[PDB]
Symmetry: D2
Subunit: 115 residues, 4 copies
């Protein structure tokens, strides 16, 4: 699993379940083309987004639909979504874990990169 996304809820102290995640790859014409998508599981994790063969070097954007998540909980969020943009595999294949901690008016995101 070269790309994994984990989302936590800072208000309820639990994984953020059923959060929609869309991944895009910057195309040759500087356009964002759909790469993969899914929803976080009961553990707040999303696996199987891509394969080592498909996950080539490039600039990727991980969009986390935080707005819909908070709306479903009856909380008016500030952000439309949380975006994480990064260059991947520019120096060989790596394993990426993109994590996000969500709050209605704030979010923190970090990345753990492994060989």
């Amino acid at each position: 699993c070269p790309l994994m996304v984990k989302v936590l809820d800072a208000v309820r102290g639990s994984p953020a379940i059923n959060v929609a995640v869309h991944v895009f790859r910057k195309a040759a014409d500087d356009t964002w083309e759909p790469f993969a998508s899914g929803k976080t599981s009961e553990s707040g994790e999303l696996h199987g987004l891509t394969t080592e063969e498909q996950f080539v070097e490039g600039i990727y954007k991980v969009e986390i639909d935080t707005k819909s998540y908070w709306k479903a909980l009856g909380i008016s969020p500030f952000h439309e979504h949380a975006e994480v943009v990064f260059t991947a595999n520019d120096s060989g294949p790596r394993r990426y874990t993109i994590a996000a901690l969500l709050s209605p008016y704030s979010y923190s995101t970090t990345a753990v990169v492994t060989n």
Copy 2:
């Protein structure tokens, strides 16, 4: 000052100075059109981006060029930049403060609306 941006450095424990910030407004055709831009001051703050008259309801994107900031410090950052996308509600007198705490592989952002 309807919109203000503040950036901090979590590695050095100081304001993030000279950080480029670009603000965009979503156009009728779902395109991001330039709205305002500038660089954070010595206090890591950026004021005077817009006026109450110009800052109408809509979806705005604040792009913080974090990559260039870390590069200038000799640190390889993870993110290309930090983006904050939000809807300006306008309902009632409101000042928006977008703050971001930067680390090489992480960043936290919060909004203070008063």
Copy 3:
């Protein structure tokens, strides 16, 4: 104003008002002796805790009563309080700003030293 505290609310997107803050200094016998205290203002800030003369080198602990803050809002918090323990170096002119972003089950704290 050598030491300043700022607290924000990540749930409501506003300053954390009326938050009790207690500052302690580690005594010669490794005990925490009261140093200063107060409550955050409408801007979520707390100034005038000490003076340059009184704020000598040493280990300080800033305790933020986060529990009471969330209780007053009807939210069951996880932490008893938020503690920030640091050493005041003094080496060179320095102002310390301790900031904390609060959520019911999480909090982030950073220090800005200028």
Copy 4:
């Protein structure tokens, strides 16, 4: 595993390895008595701190020796350590995951509580 601690490094984008962790329980005399201790593994995690039987209701303090961690990396940290104080099991046994994201002058901590 009723109590687990996970520590990440926001500067290197990796788990924080070999971080000393001390857990204390507030005694009847308002004193902090040693409860358990250990060091994070290669995954930045610390398991086996206690058992369901030993982890009774009470106020616990998880002290993460962040200072030593940054010192070993040649970085002058701001905090002496990171402390997480919370009441546990006050309404029945729960599983607690205490996570911390570390930076030289900042740290974020969150808790994930499960049944």
